[PDB]
Amino acid sequence: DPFELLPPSVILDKFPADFQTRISSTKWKDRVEALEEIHNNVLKPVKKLAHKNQDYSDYLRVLANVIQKDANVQAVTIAANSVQLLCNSLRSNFTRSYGAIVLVPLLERTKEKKPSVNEAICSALDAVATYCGFDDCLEETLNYMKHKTPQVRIECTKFLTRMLQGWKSDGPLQNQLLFKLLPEVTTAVLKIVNDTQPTTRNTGFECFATLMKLVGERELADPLEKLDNLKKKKIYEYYEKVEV
Amino acid sequence: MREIVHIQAGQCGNQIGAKFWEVISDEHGIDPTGSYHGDSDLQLERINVYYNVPRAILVDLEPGTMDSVRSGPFGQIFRPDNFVFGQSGAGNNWAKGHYTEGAELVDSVLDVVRKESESCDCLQGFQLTHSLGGGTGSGMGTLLISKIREEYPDRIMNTFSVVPSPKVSDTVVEPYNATLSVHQLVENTDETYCIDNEALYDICFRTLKLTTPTYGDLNHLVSATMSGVTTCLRFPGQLNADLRKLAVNMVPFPRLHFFMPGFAPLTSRGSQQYRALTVPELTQQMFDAKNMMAACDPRHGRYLTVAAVFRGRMSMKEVDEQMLNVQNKNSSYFVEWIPNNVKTAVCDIPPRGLKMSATFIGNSTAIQELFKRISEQFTAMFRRKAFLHWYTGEGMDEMEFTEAESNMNDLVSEYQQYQDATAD
Amino acid sequence: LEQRASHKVWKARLNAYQELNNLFTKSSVIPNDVANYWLDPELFASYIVDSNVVAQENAIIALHTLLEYISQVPNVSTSKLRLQWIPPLVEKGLSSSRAATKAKATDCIMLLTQSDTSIQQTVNLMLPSLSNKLPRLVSSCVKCLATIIEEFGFINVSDINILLSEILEPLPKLSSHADRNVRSETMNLILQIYKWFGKELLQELLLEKLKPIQQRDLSRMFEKYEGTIPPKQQPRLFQWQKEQEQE
Amino acid sequence: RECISIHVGQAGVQIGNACWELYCLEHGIQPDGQMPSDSFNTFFSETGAGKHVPRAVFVDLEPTVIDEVRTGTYRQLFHPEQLITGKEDAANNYARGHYTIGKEIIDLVLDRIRKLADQCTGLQGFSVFHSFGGGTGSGFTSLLMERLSVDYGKKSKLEFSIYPAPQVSTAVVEPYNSILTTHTTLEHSDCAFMVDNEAIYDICRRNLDIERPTYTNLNRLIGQIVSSITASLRFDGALNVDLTEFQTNLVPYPRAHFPLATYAPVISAEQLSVAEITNACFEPANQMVKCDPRHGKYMACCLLYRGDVVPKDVNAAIATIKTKRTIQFVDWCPTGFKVGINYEPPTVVPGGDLAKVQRAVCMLSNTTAIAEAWARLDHKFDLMYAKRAFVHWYVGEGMEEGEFSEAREDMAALEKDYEEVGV
Ligand SMILES: Nc1nc2c(ncn2[C@@H]2O[C@H](COP(=O)(O)OP(=O)(O)OP(=O)(O)O)[C@@H](O)[C@H]2O)c(=O)[nH]1
Ligand SMILES: Nc1nc2c(ncn2[C@@H]2O[C@H](COP(=O)(O)OP(=O)(O)O)[C@@H](O)[C@H]2O)c(=O)[nH]1
Ligand SMILES: [Mg+2]
Ligand SMILES: [Mg+2]
């Protein structure tokens, strides 16, 4: 039995009037307090949001606006933690409109290297992934593995690794993973495996050994041969220690 | 907490019931036609409690009692709809009143009870007068109480039950009926004034020097006691104002809610009271067991709680002094572990006939003497199994008698426990 | 005296109830067309509310032995029965002040509960009675609800989530009810839900909302409980379960 | 700086009448609300039509007492939405005031309080008037105090409790109700002035020369002493100008927040010096709570003079008492007596047995000897609870029996708290 049966709570009435201008203000501390209030006072207490007839796609598109474009790294951190709370306390809601409204912004902001901030952004991306399975993330996660920033490559690839470990789609075969496996997934993971940086390459080595674990170390033996014998024994290193 | 619905059931029920309405109609200045001819505001201040015309329902299986009431003095005032009467009588069989014949009519009664309660601003509770040795007053009364208790659980249940004595009726099934009814009242009522026919005869015989007391003579003692104990309820006053507050300050343990009433001075039917008593004299009619309406000696037990009602113009300073005196000069008779357990109240309007008067409501453990008497008579009857085929024929089981016997003895033991208790 | 079960005098109905009670024990198990207290269950629904406490109790023990004479095939028509019968049983049988009138009414519901596939069709009918004027009724029907669980339990119940919500909803008001018994006997029903699920679930939705003294007593009650979080074996089985065990 | 008054139970409501009667005489306000004449608007608001309305709520679980308000001399003063009544009273049962009956009306009461708080700009807190032994006074107040600590949590709340006394006691279970409310209202009250009805009785028999005082007698005397404490808030004095200062000056321990009030002079209507009245503040006969401060240590002490007073006479009277008596203080206390003066004369009621005096004083002192008062309640409580007497009434109206013990332990712990400070 799922504990989710609890009555739903509504937070729209909780919002204050001086919110829209405060979040869209030029003073950083206005924006911070705005987000920090509705998070600590309004989101953190609740444990289940209202599924029925509640449009959060006005609130969620302003969390995206800050997570993407807001120059204050602190305002980003507290926003991605808000986004996670919505996705966590309101499971089964982020079908497309919600999920897609924050997805591509979150992937852009993995560029952030401050440990606390990468913690919050990635943990939020884990929330949308666990509730949007492979809807829009699989295609767009690949897109941002091809991105120019080194950090977004290693983090969006680690993201595919996180998701792949929790891959348990229904059906015997012919899932979205197989329709695009060799065409897109593998051709994109090799771009990581053959990166200029070692710490980037080393993420690909896991993200390829977590791939073989899912789809058979024999099926992918074709691009394994085209790879260096030297990179091969690093990929195998992770294959032996990686589970799903 | 304003209105009180009144009920009277059985012969005695309608007798002392009508007698009560005679007394308090006068005291409030109402004539038999139902029109105010008084001359004071303290009279109509809380007339809404018992009146609307009385808020009274008249019940009996004996249909003759109908006419004994209406042909009485204030018989014209009662609402015709509130008369609910059966075809045959119960004939001193509690089972007929509780299970068979009284049960068939009890629904019609609840319909009128509902009607009277429906048009009440805020009900307090109910008020039943009846005898315990009968079949209707005891059997149908206790059945009516339970039926009200479950239909009105947010209200108080207060009964004026009179105890049978061989001195007033030689019927030997009365110990059965009364024991069965006490088994009911201990579970179903919040407060019960125990009127003992044993004590009413001994007062009419020994104190009033009447060689043959009649019902009217005993009924005179009752109606005056009732008006005395209901003085707080019918006139403005700080202390013991409503039914619930009274029971709160009188009943420390739910089963031990049987009050020993008594009042002063004891007068005859319409005799001449030339010399008015003094405040210390009235006070010394409390322990005076010749003024108790229950046949018990307060000296043989201990008071848990006491409520005194002094009626008439007098010194509130002197009353406080005399009550504070009599308590500490007899400190071994009032329980120590309930501090300030005696409460006194004064009412300026005296009862008609008297310049001053005083009623003494007491929860005394001596009341166990009364229940001993009923139990010994019940057991003497029950051990020889006399007249049981009456009750069993009406659907009762022999087991019921044993349970009522044991339950009353537990009630006696409880009183004895708190009598021997210590504060230390 | 077959139609005298609706006669005007009480003592002739009292007979017909004893006559019936003797019939359902001495009648044929295969059953005479005379045993038509299934197709018209309004009949016994009337009898349980007899308007005479002594003849009522005799109608309930006749219903009781009727309701165990039906333990034989083919009686798939136990759905109609629980609808017609347990509302009178709860409303005026559990309600009763009589020692035996109550005890046999509960035992009857037991037999109607195990007629069913699960406990769901029983709980949903006897839930409204928690919102009744009379405390001793809600005092009692919370005890009866609590022991259809401790002996049966939740199995073969479609969508349990809807059912647990429906019985957890009144528990805050019941535990703040005036009557001592309604409260005391509500902590027992809480334990019997704890005794079958975890402490985590109750404390998230319910225990939070009670008086602190109350949730202490509930914790003290769980320590004295020994045995696995869901009970390994139920103290009582349903009809389809016992028959499946036999074959 | 606005302050809202609340009156619960007959005690609160009827003492309220005496206080707002006395407030309107001190402020020259008419029974109809008009005024032919700010600091006093801490207590009153204003209509567009020049009418001055109190910032007050009256509550009783029973009409009788409040019905006389809206048909009395001051029926026009209050808005009808301020006077709230139920139908069934609590019947001297804390459980009914707190659990059974109180929950049926608590929301209506809190709602009407919001309407007075919405009219206010800088609300300070609440003054609360209620009995101890009453069912409404004990149960409902403690409930309302819990809910005010939520809906207005970040502000002050002051009590005006009527300590019970057998001379006017209406119930046996008054020790129970007192202990029960004092337990649940201990955490939610910042300061609390007890009023022993016995001392008020004793004073009225000795100095007012009345054989058997009535409630009007006691309430008028009480209203005079309540006015002396709230005078600093209503006329903008120097001492105790807002509700926080009461805690600052008199409360050096959150729990021990029960000051002893002493008032002089009480002159019958059938003048003294500044020194003579100040000596009477250290005479037990004029205290509001019956105890002996000589058996205890002072945690704080304020003097609120009002009338024809010369500030130098005060300092002389202070030095006299500080030298010619031995008022023991605790070592961790300011050994100096705080003082404030308000030159307006003590107003009495036209017709009152209390006479107009030239000067008057009200000494507020948080002495540890007031623990003697708690000991008297606790002892009475112990006797009845030892046999579980009257307990079924409480348990039968939604209350757990354990709550009795949790309250008694909180009272035993408070008695130890008073001891350890004074050793
Ligand atoms: N000094 C003073 N004491 C009062 C007054 N009114 C009541 N008391 C005391 O308060 C105690 C309780 O009585 P109430 O305040 O009337 O009770 P309540 O608050 O109305 O509660 P319930 O009536 O039970 O609903 C008694 O011991 C009285 O002595 C008053 O006007 N002045
Ligand atoms: N005090 C008093 N007692 C009565 C009166 N009438 C009957 N009793 C007593 O009540 C008992 C008889 O019950 P009764 O009320 O007459 O039978 P019912 O008509 O079936 O209720 C006996 O113990 C009588 O002593 C009366 O008028 N006054
Ligand atoms: Mg008769
Ligand atoms: Mg009151």
What features would you highlight for this structure?
part of a larger assembly, 4 chains, A: 244 residues, mainly alpha, 64% helix, B: 424 residues, alpha/beta, Rossmann fold, 60s Ribosomal Protein L30, Chain: A, Helix Hairpins, 3 domains, 7-stranded parallel beta sheet, 4-stranded mixed beta sheet, 11 strands, binds guanosine-5'-triphosphate, binds guanosine-5'-diphosphate, binds magnesium ion, cell cycle, Microtubule, Tubulin
SSE topology sketch:
This is part of a larger assembly, with two copies of chain A, one copy of chain B (424 residues) and one copy of chain D (423 residues).
Chain A: H1 20-23, H2 28-43, H3 60-69, H4 73-89, H5 97-109, H6 115-131, H7 137-145, H8 150-165, H9 176-179, H10 181-193, H11 198-215, H12 221-226, H13 229-241
Helix pairs in contact in A: 2-4, 3-4, 3-5, 4-6, 5-6, 5-7, 6-8, 7-8, 8-11, 10-11, 11-13
Chain B: E1 3-9, H1 10-28, H2 41-44, E2 56-60, H3 65-70, E3 83-85, H4 94-98, H5 101-118, E4 123-131, H6 136-151, E5 156-163, H7 174-188, E6 191-196, H8 197-207, H9 215-229, H10 231-234, H11 243-250, E7 258-259, E8 263-264, H12 279-283, E9 303-311, H13 316-328, E10 342-347, E11 357-364, H14 368-383, H15 388-393, H16 398-419
Parallel strand pairs in B: 1-2, 1-4, 2-3, 4-5, 5-6, 6-7, 9-10
Antiparallel strand pairs in B: 8-11, 9-11
Helix pairs in contact in B: 1-6, 1-9, 5-6, 6-7, 7-14, 7-16, 8-9, 14-16
Chain D: E1 3-8, H1 9-26, E2 44-46, E3 52-54, E4 56-60, H2 63-69, E5 83-85, H3 94-100, H4 106-119, E6 125-131, H5 135-151, E7 156-163, H6 174-184, E8 191-196, H7 197-206, H8 215-234, H9 243-250, E9 260-264, H10 274-280, E10 298-307, H11 311-324, E11 338-342, E12 359-367, H12 371-386, H13 391-395, H14 402-421
Parallel strand pairs in D: 1-4, 1-6, 4-5, 6-7, 7-8, 10-11
Antiparallel strand pairs in D: 2-3, 9-12, 10-12
Helix pairs in contact in D: 1-8, 3-5, 5-6, 6-12, 6-14, 7-8, 10-11, 12-14
One magnesium ion (MG) binds at residues 9-10, 62, 89, 134, 136 of chain D.
Enzyme class (chain D): hydrolase
Binding site for Mg(2+) (chain D): 62
EC number (chain D): 3.6.5.-
